[model samples]
Target: LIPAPPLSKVPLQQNFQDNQFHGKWYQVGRAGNAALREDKDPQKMTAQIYELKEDKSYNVTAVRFRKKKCDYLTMTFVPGSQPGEFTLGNIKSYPGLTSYLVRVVSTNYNQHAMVFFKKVSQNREYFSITLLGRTKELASELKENFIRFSKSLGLPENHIVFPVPIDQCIDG
Candidate 1:
């Protein structure tokens, strides 16, 4: 209920069929921006996948500045009651983002992206979309998955400002 964004009817990617949220995800390339501007620490921003606890919650640690430093920061993801949407909460100050699921890589939940239309709390108004992955070493299939996925969701293409490459990530 954290001031939910405009109740939208977003559609998940066609490939979103299985549970891809169960593996080690490194910060690969990001296709768009969310909040942070100068990504001095790309390696630190990454996510790892795991089974949803009995409580039906999944956690993602995004360190955009410290890739190897465990417990750097984290976000919890869960199946958004609305189809084709995810609720990402419990975020860290680094990105200070809470995005709604627009698309995901059902193959492994390793590749995914989200969009935050709500003006970033009077601070990150500059950010729009937030792209994420389970690993930095994504194959062409995965990258293409991201592209196709983002497009299918009906998210504004113009929202992208800074799309980082997978190899350039620093993993905070």
Candidate 2:
């Protein structure tokens, strides 16, 4: 099968509020996904916000609910573990797209999903996103959230990642 490619640029997580970083973004690249298996456009993906709550928890959507789902692909975001960081937790894609699994969330903490670099088999790549930087510089410990979390999940450097800076996005 075709392999997943590195991201275009480092997509920065604009904000890491108490978990309320919300907005719409063009689907860019992913570390791993079903479409990747077929060598499809990386934009055939989904994204959401990482709004955290007072409990140090978060709020976010699984798919493009604010937008039009029919015109875009949507997936599920579950509460996985991103130790010492504000993460989406364990995000499971819609059952149909189970072919792609969550390998790692973005360390930058943006909603971009980095499809795992390698697939467990011909079926899917591990769910992963390597967040490179924050729109706002973050504390080193805070920045390590996703990175540390992914490693906790056994995410290795072989992991595939996606990053598209907002400046490079195509405006509709």
Candidate 3:
């Protein structure tokens, strides 16, 4: 029998407003995602823009880059029944790639965002914490709070890593 990794219970925002949340967000620090577990690329990803669609969904274009590759991935964030929850699916380029779960941990709808991601495929599940901010860099206090949130969810301090600055992004 295969044993699963420990899953942490993190509190999600009870009310999430997509209109207020839509904009450019920078992914600053992240831990425990599938990419991190596989260790295929040491590179980091940053910068994404979300636009609210007419169907009450979100149109997102995310830019990611590392040592090997840099590309912009567009997807749709379908709102779920619960607040602060969404399904990261409808990849226009890749139809088969759907069904990832996303949850907003905390965000003031402007400056900062604490997000959680869960993806499952081929019987393996992956979890991660992604922190975003309005600009390329977060304030010192907010950065500390981001790390603290990761710690509260069972991610060790050493495991958390901040990616490169967004100015160097491929789409930047």
lDDT of 1 by residue, 1-172 (tens): 1222333433345544335444455544443334334556423334434444555566654434333334445556665664334555554543545333433423335354443333343343322234455445556665565555444544344423333433222342
The candidate maximizing TM-score is 3
Candidate 2 matches the true fold with a TM-score of 0.33
- Tens digits of per-residue lDDT for model 3 on 48-110? 888888877887788876554677777787888887788875544454444488888889977
lDDT of 2 by residue, 53-155 (tens): 4555445433433234223333333433432233233334334232332333233335333223222443454334433332313344543554554455444
- Of 1 and 3, the candidate ahead on lDDT is 3
Report lDDT (CA) for all predictions.
0.43, 0.36, 0.73
- On lDDT, who's better, 1 or 2? 1
Window of ten residues with lowest summed lDDT in model 1: 1-10
Decoy 3 TM-score against native: 0.79
Q: By the lDDT metric, which is better: model 2 or model 3?
A: 3
The total number of steric clashes, by the backbone 3 Å criterion, in model 2 comes to 24
| Clash number by candidate, in order | 29, 24, 0
lDDT of candidate 1 at residue 44, scale 0 to 100: 34
What is the full ranking by TM-score, best candidate first? 3, 1, 2
Candidate 2 C-alpha error for residue 161, in Å: 8.1
Alpha-carbon TM-score of each model against the true structure: 0.49, 0.33, 0.79
lDDT at position 123, candidate 2 = 49
